[PDB]
Each structure stands twice: as structure tokens, then as C-alpha cells.
Amino acid sequence: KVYNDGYDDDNYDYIVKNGEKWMDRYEIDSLIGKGSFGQVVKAYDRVEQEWVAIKIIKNKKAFLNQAQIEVRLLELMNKHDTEMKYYIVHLKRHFMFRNHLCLVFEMLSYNLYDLLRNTNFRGVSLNLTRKFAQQMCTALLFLATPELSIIHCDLKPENILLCNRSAIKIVDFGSSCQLGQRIYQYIQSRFYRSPEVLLGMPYDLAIDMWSLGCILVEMHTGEPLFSGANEVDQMNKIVEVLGIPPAHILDQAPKARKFFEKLPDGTWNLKEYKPPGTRKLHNILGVETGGPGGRRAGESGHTVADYLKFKDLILRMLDYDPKTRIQPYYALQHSFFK
Ligand SMILES: C=C(c1ccc2c(c1)CC(C)(C)c1c(N)ncnc1-2)C1CCNCC1
């Protein structure tokens, strides 16, 4: 049984051969990753004389079409004249090779999850968190450009890469869409899933900001803020920290009744967790006790006043109301950055 004249396995993936030379241009070094879309190889480009990351899309129509959307979005972002652009991974070019769409990107380093592992899941300092936070708010401002309006739809530590410097770039626009395009109900990775998506509600660019808030707390503590085992557990861990969501949201939510019940007086409550709003971010961060674990007492940039400013920024990111949740332009104005 032969797939694609022998070039593919039985899973529509190109069979990666170490040292293969494509088109008298690319020298394939190695496989550096597998995903649903296909694979990523490290390769040397002879024309440009540099190492690149080549995303090899599966030879299967469902995956080709998804990647054509991904290419269209990266090419749109590329056409834009800003320095904000460079917080997104740069698509250099694309080609077909043996019936596979290949995307050529700049070679980046490891992701923010890898970083956290290398902290033994104790987190990075508030200062590094702040630099990560600023770049990420800047990236989200760029995506919020009226002509782009890209919702990422899957922000998480493993989709933010180090270049090598604490320079970082967003990757994986493979779940992404533009505002005004229709609804998909099961989106975002579970720990980073906005309450509107949990509630089956219409969403916009604010879902990215919600993920961002979850991310930043994680980068500093070492662990996920809301580590849900499923959707019910997820909404419940949100409610522990942030309380019961506004009545105007729940009165309207196609999936309100999955997590909440309307009590006889018309108020909402959950259907054993800490009571709504009782696991305070204030404590998770250790605002007054020398940061998380107490591991940052007296370190510069880690005063009680610094932590309060950080706590304030996150809670604006974790606002239940997507209309009022902090937006990228103003997140950059916040005193955490000043
Ligand atoms: C196959 C994956 C993957 C591996 C490496 C990279 C990417 C994705 C993204 C890009 C292509 C941007 C890139 C880059 N530019 N430089 C270096 N490595 C990468 C995985 C990661 C974990 N989740 C499943 C998919």
C-alpha cells in the first residue's frame, strides 16, 4: 500500500528524511514537532543562508484548506507597516512540494511552557512577566488593527515562543479567524477558555485578552490559574476566584444551565468549591507575603505596590463582561508598565 508515490505515511504526513535536499534549496535537518495539521522541520535555506522552520501541512484536503486560511492571515499581517508586526512569527514564503503545502518561518527557540519547565514550574520573576506582558499586549493591539481583526483563538504558553533576550512571538494562527466570521462553540484550550465561549455566547477579540490574563499569572506562579478537568470544573475554578458572573450575561447565555441555576429570588448560583469570589487573586499572587511561594521577598520590582498594580491589570483582563474587559491599547497605558 503506497501513499503519494511513497512520500507519505498512512496519515497523510510527508515522511521526513534527515538530510534530504528539496528543490536545490532546502536541506532538511530534522523533525522538531508533530501536530494535527502535519509536521514542523528544521531546515537550512541555501539561497538565504539561514536555518528555517518549515511547517509541512498534511496531504489531505481538510488540512490544506485550513492552512490556506493560515497563509492568508500571515500574508495580511505581513503587508502591514508597523514594528508591532514582529511580535508575530514571520512567514517568509510558502510552496507546494510533493503535494504538501509548506510554510517557511523564521527559526524561533522554545516556547513559554518549556521556560516554565526550566523554572521547575516555580515561574519567572514579575519583571520578566512584565516584559512578556508588554510584548503580548502589543501583539494583541496589532491583531486588533481594524483591517486585520484577527482573533487568535488559542493563546497558551506553548503558543508563545522565545526567539533565542526575552523577545517573544505569538505562533499558531491555525485556529484563528477574523471578526465578523461565524461562530464556533468549542474553541480555545480549556485552561484559557473565556467565560463567553464556556457559556456558548458570541465572542470577539476579548477572548484573547482573557487567555492573556490566565497566561501572565501562570508565568509568574509556575502553574495554571484555572486548571479545569472538564468544562464544569473549569467554570467552577473561574467562579472560585472571580465570583458569579453578571446576571445580564447569564440571563442571556445558551449554556448558563450547564453550570448555574436561577434561584427563586431570580439570582444565580452554582448547581465542593470555595464560595464565589473567595480564592482571591491577591493571595494566589502573594501580594503581601513576598509573591507566590514567598520566593520573591525583597527582590527589586517585587514590592507590595508592584504586585497590586499587577493584580489590578489581571482583573481588568479577567473581567466577565467582554465589552468592559481591558483592551490592548489601554492595557499598555496601565501603571504596571510605567
Ligand atoms: C509541531 C509543533 C511546532 C514545533 C515547532 C515550531 C512550531 C510548532 C511553530 C513554528 C513553526 C512557528 C516554529 C518556529 N518558527 N520555530 C521553531 N519551532 C516552531 C507543535 C508545538 C506543540 N504543540 C503541537 C505543535
From Swiss-Prot:
Any idea which residues bear Phosphotyrosine here? 7, 12, 26, 44, 86, 184, 186, 307
Kindly list the positions annotated as binding ATP.
Answer: 32-40, 55, 105-108
Query: Which residues are catalytic?
Result: 154
**This protein is called what?**
Dual specificity tyrosine-phosphorylation-regulated kinase 1A
Biological role stated in the UniProt entry: Dual-specificity kinase which possesses both serine/threonine and tyrosine kinase activities. Plays an important role in double-strand breaks (DSBs) repair following DNA damage. Mechanistically, phosphorylates RNF169 and increases its ability to block accumulation of TP53BP1 at the DSB sites thereby promoting homologous recombination repair (HRR).
Which body tissues produce this protein?
Ubiquitous. Highest levels in skeletal muscle, testis, fetal lung and fetal kidney.
Tell me the residues on which Phosphoserine occurs: 175
Q: Where is this region: Disordered?
A: 272-300
Q: Which family does it belong to?
A: Belongs to the protein kinase superfamily. CMGC Ser/Thr protein kinase family. MNB/DYRK subfamily.
Gene encoding this polypeptide? DYRK1A
Q: Which domain of life is it from?
A: Eukaryota
Q: Which residues form the Protein kinase domain?
A: 26-337
